[PDB]
Copies of this chain bind each other. A is one copy, B any other.
């Protein structure tokens, strides 16, 4: 169980500053020691901050931790390429008697203009339905920074199963792409009036819809 909320994405131009907030409650962030972890691409997560504001060895003074009430923050000044990573907050929860973690934040050092994703929502193909299978594909392309949050709905109701979203990858145009897909049975697909893919990018959200219809 996790109550710790962090922004999915933060970014700034090199030399600038980012702040990564993590909001919790009294049982966790409010009464216990907050740690921060850095997860570099394809690397094991390393402790960078502990006891709210103590830097781990080798971590530059540009990185600073703070805590106010039930929320903790990791601030990074003089932002440089090597700070690009996913960061997450970790804290003891005294009511739960276990550790709770933030959902993580990708930090991007802006090297090009920001671009809103192009969202193209594909219904299940005829060939697929003929095989009693159904896959909804939400193609997400031409975005920068390379981080998206995807949420699917079936008639305004959040989908909690069969969702897979790829990790953004830099394409030939230097912008990112990803696809999110939902595996359903033709019955599940036809039992609902519509399906929606909601794509969040830098606090900007776009929702697209698809419904079962014959050619």
Decide yes or no whether A185 CB sits under 8 A from chain B. Answer: no
Contact across chains for A47 and B139 when beta carbons are under 8 A apart:
no
Q: How many identical chains are in the complex? A: 2
Choice from B45, B100, B169, B179 contacting A39 with Cβ under 8 Å: B45
- Taken residue by residue from 122 to 133, chain A's Cβ proximity to chain B (1 for < 8 Å, 0 otherwise) reads as 110111100001
A141-B164, A164-B171, A167-B169 known; A97-B33 Cβ under 8 A: yes
Across-interface contacts of A198 in B (CB, < 8 A):
none
Given contacts A44-B88, A44-B104, A104-B44, contact A128 B137 (CB under 8 A): no
Picked from B35, B167, B178, the residue with its CB within 8 Å of the CB of A98 is B35
Given A135-B139, A139-B137, A181-B139: A99 in contact with B102 (beta carbons within 8 A): no
Closest-CB distance, A127 to chain B (whole angstroms): 8
- In the bound complex, residues from chain B placing their C-beta under 8 Å from that of A56 are 1
- Set of chain B residues within 8 Å of A126, measured between Cβ atoms: 213
Q: Which of B99, B102, B178 makes the CB contact (< 8 A) with A35?
A: B99
Rounded to whole angstroms, the CA-CA distance of A102 and B141 in the bound complex is: 28
- A113 proximal to B (CB < 8 A): no
Q: Does A7 contact B (CB under 8 A)?
A: no
Q: Do residues B86 and A90 form an inter-chain contact, with CB atoms below 8 A?
A: no
Docked Cα-Cα span, A101 to B98, in Å, equals: 10
In the bound complex, residues from chain B placing their C-beta under 8 Å from that of A102 are 44
Interface: A60 (CB within 8 A): no
User: Does A103 have its Cβ within 8 Å of any Cβ on chain B?
Assistant: yes
What residues of B have a CB within 8 angstroms of the CB of A98 in the complex?
A: 32-33, 35, 47, 50, 90, 92, 99
Q: Is the CB of A178 within 8 A of B166?
A: yes
A92-B91 Cα distance, complex, nearest whole Å? 9
> What are 6 A-B pairs at a CB distance below 8 A?
A1-B47, A35-B97, A43-B104, A50-B97, A120-B137, A121-B125
